[PDB]
Design a protein around this ligand. Structure first.
Ligand SMILES: Nc1ncnc2c1ncn2[C@@H]1O[C@H](COP(=O)(O)OP(=O)(O)O)[C@@H](O)[C@H]1O
Ligand SMILES: Nc1ncnc2c1ncn2[C@@H]1O[C@H](COP(=O)(O)OP(=O)(O)O)[C@@H](O)[C@H]1O
Ligand SMILES: [Mg+2]
Ligand SMILES: [Mg+2]
Ligand SMILES: [Mg+2]
Ligand SMILES: [Mg+2]
Lengths: 96, 364, 77, 525, 540, 105, 147
């Protein structure tokens, strides 16, 4: 008996301050570093392993980013902007 | 086994009435020796009748008194059926032993075991003026190997202890001495220790030790002793290597590790008197024997037989042989049954027919 | 447990008053950093990766999982 | 509000307490259960119980003794523990009456429960019971008779008391023989009260009627190797010396020498000391030597060379019994032979009982120590015979100490309850009801005696009550035929001490149990 | 309202203040006082049925199954297995009353329970518990002064012991040994008066040896003006009875001497062995001769002795006792007037004690023997030897006699007495009520609550005796007010009179004063606790 | 002044008087018992006379300590170290008071 | 305390006189040693080991202040700050080996009993800073600042 009493529900995390900004910037930098080498006429291709058993061997930035599953919300925002760049103009995905 | 007492003891019956029957079988074995199955069967039959008697509406006190009256009448009837027996009538004793052995596995070896039992009982008691038999005077020795046909009635004594004095066996005209002290370095009951502060003392220690041992052995030998039995010792060495070497040098059979509880039987059989101090070890305390020889049982072991003794004692030893151990134990039990039959024939010298005749006469 | 014999927990007086004030202060501190021109937005992750970047107090308080009654009072306010 | 039924809990886990109704119910149930269990073993027609141990040994016992039944049971009811302790103390004080006292206490507590059901304060019951106990004790004291002055009458009373004690046991089959045996054994004590002087030897095999009281003494020890097995006109010296590696009691002493020859000299000196001690013992002019401790090989060899019987390891009881039966003195120093008294007997020999051998002393000089050989067909039979014989010997010794005797068969209880009923009729209030319940339990005791026999207990008890009201103060139950008879003529005699102890102990235990209004148990370990 | 605190910070960060704070329990404020008062009330109401002559016994079972039947309040509370701290406080209060006074260990608990019960309804009306404690202290002072006023002095002379007998009888009335009321009271009075420094000094209970043996009857309990010993004569053949014994008390075993320092005696030759054995024999003979030279008829040793000494003592007509305990050695030396000698060399005729009779006592069919050393000249040590039909009544008799001895000790310390049966409590309640009338209003409630709580003892006595509590207590109080007689109390035994002085119901004044003081202090101490912090782990 | 609890009196303590009207107090740190002279002291003798002399010497050592205490005029004896039963009886014979195992404080 | 052998010490007693004289001789030797120490003018004795009961008794008899220091570092620091040599045996100190201090006394600071070796002159080899405070952590921080 005597269950614990608390304001917010269980497993509700919260981080604040300089740590959040540093983490967001680091996540964005990591996302950029993933496809940093896929830019230019001398870019080299990457071989992606699809969850359903397929293989995506591509050089496009948007395909590589959309083949990657991430947890940090900043990385999700970066993947989203890559998709929007792909949909709006058709290229520039790895530059943005 | 076929013995009723052994069967009842070996199996744990777990029920109070059955445990009572087991104790009853023990009591019958103590008093009579055989008939142990019969008493249990009789008790079971009596209680089986009692169940119907109780169902008929009879209190279990009229039943008890009536059973007592019937028991008294039955004792009278059995005594009326009796027949006087004399211990000098060997045929009756042989018939009783054969009847006792008829129900056992050694029934085939009856023409050998029955006279053995009769002679064993007759050789440990006085046929005139004897009211009981001490079966502890008839030692039973079980040795594996051979068949039941190899059972023996050694008139002297047999010892399972091996002769330490290897190389000397079969002493003829033996003069056996049984000592209870130890042939080793001197030692007092008090805490004792020898202090050495000089090499001359270091040599003198073992020089005087060997002198003491040699003096002990010389004192033993001077009495004419040639077979020596040494009682088992724990606190100090009963026989040292030096003492054994000295005794072997003087041609004396040495036999150590004699059990304390066997001293009475050995002394009664041979006629020796135990010696606990060398000062009292004299020739008059030795047991003269015709032959003390260590024999082997065709590679199945070794036995030490001392057969033929001046002024023979009132004891006998039976050696039991067999192919396997189980038949040896059952043969021992059967021989014990025969000995107990002859014993309970010594006291209350009366004889009746068997074969269910007393029971049917009782019933009628 | 006691003479009242109620299947539950009971808090009375300063304890419950402090609990209510603590819950209200927690709710206030959740959104206190998102006030005025120098305020900053927040990310809210919906346990399945859904992200809500918001500055509105109502959105933050509705999306949160709130258990204390006073905190619920402030959220519905 | 009680401790148990309060909103707050005041106890450890496992600790509890029982209030008025619960405590009284638990006490009454336990006491009545104990009394019902122990009864049906009461009176000449009582039956025996089987005590089957649940331990590893799984011992088996058959007994009619109330104390033996009550001590060998695991009872958790505290009132049952009180009754068991009462029975044990009764057995300690006198050898008989454990079943009677337990049954009386149980009946009293049953009547107490009935009275409590009728809205009577337990203190009123206690006061009424105290008055009833006083009246019953006075009546029993006035009813006692004495015959210690007359030798033949006292012997007849002893025979009657032994028979009455043995009538309820397994020995009732040979009651006459066993009564004569017990009376002779007690009379051989020459007025001594110690029952350790009467040794009981149980040998399996043979009928119960084969049991006998030896004319001398029997010892279960052995003799040395070279010593005589038969001594005529024995001169016995009882000793409590070492006779084994006898060392000087200076524990800091040791042998410190520089050669083995000195060690040999020292050990020869030790052997010479033992020889000199044996010579000093022999200087007393003795034929048999009995030592409490062990005798090693050198002293027994010396004794055999001297032609002296040497019996070793006869424990404290053994040497005390030999001293009592032969008149010798248990000595430990032998520097003054003229100051030590030697035992004497006409013959020492070895007898053959069953399959075992024992040392037999015949024609003992004093004989103030007995050995009784019990023969039986079962170990349980032997144990129960020994217990019954112990009961008879205890009662006979008590009667020798105090020769006052009362009449059994319910006569004493009947007159006790008659006096209690007279007092109750003379008393106003509910204490009269309490005394009537006391008398009711007193009647209930011979009622149970008659019930165990299958007779019409109600009619017999009514006849006894009428006879005791009409002045027939010796009327009692005649268990031979199931009618009432004269206890004086029939020789149903009891020790006055036993009956008084039964009454007083039962009343005391009932009073202490009845005073309880709360049972509080700590948490068991 | 429990589990300490649970906030976990207003920023969501962990908030751990006390180790295992999520398992510990806390109770604070008026709820803690109510819980304590209710537990104390439960204990007091359990104990109140064992008050007075008509009180009943509690029957306690320990953790091993052993059963104790008793009426002693301190013993009952000690046997109890409790977790509540207030219950432990009540047990300690009974222990304190037992230690200081030895009687009235049940009245203190009932008084404390009544005081806390009244304090409960006082607290419900909004009174600070410190005010209640102060009012209780003031009323206790008034009651103690009244007790001093209404006390009576009794003679504590050996020539006339009747008031002492009456007081001991009053103490023993509630116990099971009341079937031998006057006998127990008189033996207790004689025991206390025998071992006592007459100049109003202390009574050392170490000089009273209370030992019980099963068998016999409770009426067979007797006072022995000597020492009882569980031992017997060492050799079975020495006489069982010694008359005009000259006892030699010895603390040296009848053995060859043994140095305390570790030592080695070296035997280097046969002559050394002969000298050693001769020395041992001569030492035995010499100690026996030294004992015999003083003219002693009996020898008592503490450390036992061996066979040679035993047979030499028997041969020299010197009955001897061995393995006597140290306390028993001291008691024998005190009673017989003899000194304790550490070795035979110092034994002289002037150090021998004298006893008129030393006897060995049998106990029926039990083979157990015990020694009686009695008929001493001016024995300053005494022994109470108790018999009974079972060990449980023996233990109860032991503690009842201890209560009686403590009461007579209290009379020796101070001879002022008051009359029981609730008369003293009723008079004190009347005095407190009268004092409250002329007192400021606020503490009037506390003083009147104290008076009402004082009135619990006569009500409990009347209830245990089957009478109507309120009616009888009110009638007795009205009679006390009408005619000035503070000796009117509850007629528990239905003797037809309420005058407790005529009924000879007497109890020590210091006992009542100590009861009131202890109850007031414990009630104040309990009333001042407003917070409980238990581990709450419920460990196994 | 000073008051402290009674400390495990030995046999014969109850024979000592329990009140003095002008006592001299012997404050000691001394073990008044029959004991080994030292934990590493061993006695080696080869004569029974020397054995008896050693026993009498131990007794005389204890009695010399007791006599030195007694002749000082003190009637109350207190000690940190144990006071044995022999010393307790000795002081009881002289109408003196002894108390061993008295704590440091 | 009295110095003892390094291998093993056994008091071999062969007569009653030795047994009766051993303890008296040992006590006399202890008294003589303490008297010899006190005869040099020493009034404070500091030891690094345990203190015997007889030695303490004779130090009290001759009015000698005893201080026992468990740490060898503390003993060395005291020798440095006082000017004494740590003698390895219990011999009386020579003039040069004797330490000197302006005042040694037992004092209580707060609730702690301390022994103070105090120099009046503003000199010496070792100086001590006594830090007060309301918390152990605060004093630790102040000690770090002092370092
Ligand atoms: N032959 C008899 N006739 C009548 N009553 C008997 C006879 N023998 C014994 N009793 C009665 O039986 C009662 C109980 O004895 P018993 O059954 O041996 O158990 P216990 O003696 O232990 O109470 C005794 O009070 C006695 O009066
Ligand atoms: N004969 C009596 N009649 C009336 N009251 C009594 C009598 N004897 C004792 N009392 C009262 O019973 C109360 C309780 O006494 P008791 O139960 O003997 O010991 P405790 O005080 O330890 O409970 C006492 O306060 C006393 O006044
Ligand atoms: Mg492109
Ligand atoms: Mg057969
Ligand atoms: Mg009987
Ligand atoms: Mg009382």
């Amino acid at each position: 008996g005597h269950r614990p009493v608390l304001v917010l529900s269980q497993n509700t995390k919260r981080e604040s301050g300089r740590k959040v900004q540093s983490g967001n910037i680091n996540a964005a930098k990591t996302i950029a570093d993933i496809i940093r080498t896929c830019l230019g006429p001398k870019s080299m291709m990457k071989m992606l392993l699809d969850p359903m058993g397929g293989i995506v061997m591509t050089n496009d930035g948007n395909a590589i980013l959309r083949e990657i599953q991430v947890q940090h919300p900043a990385a999700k925002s970066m993947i989203e902007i890559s998709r929007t760049q792909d949909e709006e103009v058709g290229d520039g995905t790895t530059s943005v | 086994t076929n013995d009723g007492a052994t069967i009842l003891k070996q199996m744990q019956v777990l029920h109070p009435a059955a445990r009572m029957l087991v104790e009853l079988s023990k009591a019958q074995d103590i008093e009579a020796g055989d008939g142990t199955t019969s008493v249990v069967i009789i008790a079971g039959s009596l209680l089986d009748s009692c169940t119907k008697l109780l169902q008929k509406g009879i209190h279990p006190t009229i039943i008890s008194e009536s059973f007592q009256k019937a028991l008294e009448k039955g004792i009278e009837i059995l005594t009326d059926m009796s027949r006087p027996v004399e211990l000098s009538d060997r045929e009756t004793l042989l018939n009783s032993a054969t009847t006792s052995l008829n129900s056992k596995v050694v029934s085939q070896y009856s023409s050998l075991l029955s006279p053995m039992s009769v002679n064993a009982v007759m050789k440990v008691i006085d046929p005139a003026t004897a009211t009981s038999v001490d079966l502890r005077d008839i030692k039973i020795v079980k040795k594996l190997g051979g068949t039941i046909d190899d059972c023996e009635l050694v008139e002297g004594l047999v010892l399972t202890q091996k002769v330490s004095n290897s190389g000397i066996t079969r002493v003829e005209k033996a003069k056996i001495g049984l000592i209870q002290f130890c042939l080793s370095a001197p030692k007092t009951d008090m805490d004792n220790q020898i202090v050495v502060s000089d090499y001359a003392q270091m040599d003198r220690v073992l020089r005087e030790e060997r002198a003491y041992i040699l003096n002990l052995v010389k004192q033993i030998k001077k009495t004419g002793c040639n077979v020596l039995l040494i009682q088992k010792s724990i606190l100090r060495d009963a026989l040292s290597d030096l003492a054994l070497h000295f005794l072997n040098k003087m041609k004396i059979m040495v036999i150590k590790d004699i059990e304390r509880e066997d001293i009475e039987f050995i002394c009664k059989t041979i006629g020796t008197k135990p010696v606990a101090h060398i000062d009292q070890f004299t020739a008059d305390m030795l047991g003269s024997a015709e032959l003390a020889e260590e024999v082997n049982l065709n590679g199945s072991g070794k036995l030490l037989k001392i057969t033929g003794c001046a002024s023979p004692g009132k004891t006998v030893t039976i050696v039991v042989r067999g192919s396997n151990k189980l038949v040896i134990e059952e043969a021992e039990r059967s021989i014990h049954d025969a000995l107990c039959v002859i014993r309970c024939l010594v006291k209350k010298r009366a004889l009746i027919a068997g074969g269910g005749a007393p029971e049917i006469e009782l019933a009628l | 447990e006691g003479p009242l014999s109620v299947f539950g927990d009971r808090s009375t007086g300063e304890t419950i008053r402090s609990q209510n004030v603590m819950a209200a202060a927690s709710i206030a501190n959740i959104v206190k950093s998102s006030l005025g021109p120098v305020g900053l937005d927040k990310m809210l992750v919906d346990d399945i990766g859904d992200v809500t970047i918001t500055n509105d107090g109502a959105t933050i308080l509705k999306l949160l999982e709130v258990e204390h009654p006073a905190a619920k009072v402030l959220c519905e306010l | 509000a009680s401790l148990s039924l309060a909103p707050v809990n005041i106890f450890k886990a496992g600790a509890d307490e029982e209030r008025a109704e619960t405590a009284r119910l638990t006490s009454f149930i336990g006491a009545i259960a104990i009394g019902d269990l122990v009864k049906s073993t009461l009176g000449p027609k009582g039956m025996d119980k089987i005590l089957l141990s649940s331990g590893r040994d799984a011992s088996l016992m058959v007994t009619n003794d109330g104390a033996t039944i009550l001590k060998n049971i695991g009872v958790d009811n505290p009132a049952a523990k009180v009754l068991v302790d009462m029975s044990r103390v009764q057995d300690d004080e006198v050898g008989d009456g454990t079943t009677s006292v337990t049954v009386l206490a149980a009946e009293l507590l049953r009547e107490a429960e009935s009275l409590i059901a009728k809205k009577i304060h337990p203190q009123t019951i206690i006061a009424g019971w105290r008055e009833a106990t006083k009246a019953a004790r006075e009546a029993l004291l006035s009813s006692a008779v004495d015959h210690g002055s007359d030798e033949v009458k006292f012997r007849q009373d002893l025979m009657n008391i032994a028979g009455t004690t043995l009538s309820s046991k397994l020995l009732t089959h040979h009651k006459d023989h066993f009564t004569k045996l017990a009376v002779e054994a007690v009379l051989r004590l020459k007025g001594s009260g110690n029952l350790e002087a009467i040794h009981i030897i149980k040998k399996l095999g043979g009928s119960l009627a084969d049991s006998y009281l030896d004319e001398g003494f029997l010892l279960d020890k052995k003799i040395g190797v070279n010593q005589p097995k038969r001594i005529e006109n024995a001169k016995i010296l009882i000793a409590n010396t070492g006779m084994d590696t006898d060392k000087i009691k200076i524990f800091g002493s040791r042998v410190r020498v520089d050669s083995t020859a000195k060690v040999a000299e020292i050990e020869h000196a030790e052997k010479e000391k033992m020889k000199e001690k044996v010579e000093r013992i022999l200087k007393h002019g003795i034929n048999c030597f009995i030592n409490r401790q062990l005798i090693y090989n050198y002293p027994e060899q010396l004794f055999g060379a001297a032609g002296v019987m040497a019996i070793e390891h006869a424990d404290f009881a053994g040497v005390e019994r030999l001293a009592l039966v032969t008149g010798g003195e248990i000595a430990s120093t032998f520097d003054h032979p003229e100051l030590v008294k030697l035992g004497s007997c006409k013959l020492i020999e070895e007898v053959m009982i069953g399959e075992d051998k024992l040392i037999h002393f015949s024609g003992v000089a004093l004989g103030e120590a007995c050995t009784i050989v019990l023969r039986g067909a079962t170990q349980q039979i032997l144990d129960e015979a020994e217990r019954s014989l112990h009961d008879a010997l205890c009662v006979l010794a008590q009667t020798v100490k105090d020769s006052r005797t009362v009449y059994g068969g319910g006569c004493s209880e009947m007159l006790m309850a008659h006096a209690v009923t007279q007092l109750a009729n003379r008393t106003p209030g509910k204490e009269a009801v309490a005394m009537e319940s006391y008398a009711k339990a007193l009647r209930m005791l011979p009622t149970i005696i008659a019930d165990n026999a299958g007779y019409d207990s109600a009619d017999l008890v009514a006849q006894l009550r009428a006879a005791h009201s009409e002045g027939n103060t010796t009327a009692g139950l005649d268990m031979r035929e199931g009618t009432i008879g004269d206890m004086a003529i029939l020789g149903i005699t009891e020790s006055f001490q036993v009956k008084r102890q039964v009454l007083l102990s039962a009343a005391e235990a009932a009073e202490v149990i009845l005073r309880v209004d709360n049972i509080i148990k700590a948490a068991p370990r | 309202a429990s589990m300490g605190t649970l906030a976990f910070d207003e920023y969501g960060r962990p908030f751990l203040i006390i180790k295992d704070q999520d398992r510990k329990s806390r109770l604070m404020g008026l709820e803690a006082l109510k819980s304590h008062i209710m537990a104390a009330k439960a204990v007091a109401n359990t104990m109140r049925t064992s008050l007075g002559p008509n009180g009943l016994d509690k029957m306690m079972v320990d953790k091993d199954g052993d059963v104790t039947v008793t009426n002693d309040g301190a013993t009952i509370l000690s046997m109890m297995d409790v977790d509540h701290q207030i219950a432990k406080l009540m047990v300690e209060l009974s222990k304190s009353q037992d230690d200081e006074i030895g009687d009235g260990t049940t009245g203190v608990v009932v008084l404390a329970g009544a005081l806390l019960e009244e304090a409960e309804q006082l607290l419900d009306r909004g009174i600070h518990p410190i005010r209640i404690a102060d009012g209780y202290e003031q009323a206790a002072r008034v009651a103690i002064e009244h007790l001093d006023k209404i006390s009576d002095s009794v003679l504590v002379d050996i020539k006339d012991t009747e008031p002492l007998i009456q007081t001991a009888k009053t103490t023993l009335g509630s116990k099971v040994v009341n079937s031998c009321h006057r006998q127990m009271a008189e033996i207790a009075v004689n025991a206390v008066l025998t071992v006592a420094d007459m100049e109003r000094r202390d009574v050392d209970f170490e000089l009273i040896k209370v030992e019980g043996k099963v068998g016999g009857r409770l009426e067979d309990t007797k006072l022995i003006k000597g020492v009882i010993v569980d031992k017997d004569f060492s050799h079975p053949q020495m006489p069982k009875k010694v008359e005009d014994a000259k006892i030699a008390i010895l603390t040296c075993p009848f053995e060859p001497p043994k140095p305390k320092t570790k030592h080695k005696l070296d035997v280097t030759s046969v002559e050394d062995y002969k000298a050693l054995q001769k020395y041992e024999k001569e030492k035995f003979e010499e100690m026996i001769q030294q004992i015999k030279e003083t003219g002693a008829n009996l020898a008592i040793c503490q450390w036992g002795f061996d066979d040679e000494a035993n047979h030499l003592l028997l041969q020299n007509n010197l009955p001897a006792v061995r393995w006597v305990g140290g306390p028993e050695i001291e008691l024998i030396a005190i009673a017989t007037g003899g000194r304790i000698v550490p070795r035979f060399s110092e034994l002289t005729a002037e150090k021998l004690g004298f006893a008129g009779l030393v006897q060995e006592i049998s106990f029926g069919t039990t083979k157990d023997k015990m020694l009686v050393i009695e008929q001493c000249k001016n024995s300053r040590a005494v022994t109470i030897f108790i018999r009974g039909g079972n060990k449980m009544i023996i233990e109860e008799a032991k503690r009842s006699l201890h209560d009686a001895l403590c009461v007579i000790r209290n009379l020796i310390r101070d001879n002022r007495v008051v009359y029981g049966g609730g008369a003293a409590e009723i008079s004190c309640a009347l005095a407190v009520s009268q004092e409250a009338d002329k007192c400021p209003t606020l503490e009037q409630y506390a003083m009147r609550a104290f008076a009402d709580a004082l009135e619990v003892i006569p009500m409990a006595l009347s209830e245990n005796s089957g009478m109507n509590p309120i009616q009888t207590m009110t009638e007795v109080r009205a009679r006390q007010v009408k005619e000035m007689n503070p000796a009117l109390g509850i007629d528990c035994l239905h003797k037809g009179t309420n005058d407790m002085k005529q009924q000879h119901v007497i109890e020590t004044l210091i006992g009542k004063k100590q009861q009131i003081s202890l109850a007031t202090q414990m009630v104040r101490m309990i009333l001042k606790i407003d917070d409980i912090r238990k581990p709450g782990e419920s460990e196994e | 002044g000073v008051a402290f609890k009674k400390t495990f009196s030995y046999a014969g303590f109850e024979m000592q008087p329990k009140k003095y009207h002008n006592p001299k107090i012997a404050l000691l740190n001394v073990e008044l018992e029959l004991k080994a002279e030292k934990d590493n002291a061993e006695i080696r003798v080869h004569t029974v006379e020397d054995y008896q002399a050693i026993v009498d010497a131990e007794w005389n050592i204890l009695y010399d300590k007791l006599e030195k205490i007694h002749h000082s005029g003190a009637k109350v004896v207190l000690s940190k170290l144990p006071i044995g039963d022999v010393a307790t009886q000795y002081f009881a014979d002289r109408d003196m008071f002894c108390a061993g195992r008295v704590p440091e404080e | 305390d009295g110095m003892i052998t390094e291998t093993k010490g056994t008091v071999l007693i062969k007569t009653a006189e030795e047994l009766m004289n051993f303890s008296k001789g040992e006590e006399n030797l202890m008294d003589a040693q303490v008297k010899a120490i006190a005869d040099t003018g020493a009034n404070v004795v500091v030891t690094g080991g345990k203190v015997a009961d007889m030695a303490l008794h004779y130090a009290n008899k001759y009015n000698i202040m005893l201080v026992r220091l468990n740490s060898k570092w503390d003993l060395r620091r005291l020798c440095k700050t006082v000017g004494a040599t740590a003698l390895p045996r219990l011999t009386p100190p020579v003039l040069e080996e004797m330490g000197h201090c302006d005042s040694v006394y037992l004092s209580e600071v707060g609730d702690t009993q301390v022994v103070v070796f105090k120099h009046e002159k503003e000199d010496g080899a070792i100086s001590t800073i006594v830090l007060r405070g309301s918390t152990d952590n605060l004093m630790d921080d102040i000690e770090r600042a002092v370092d």
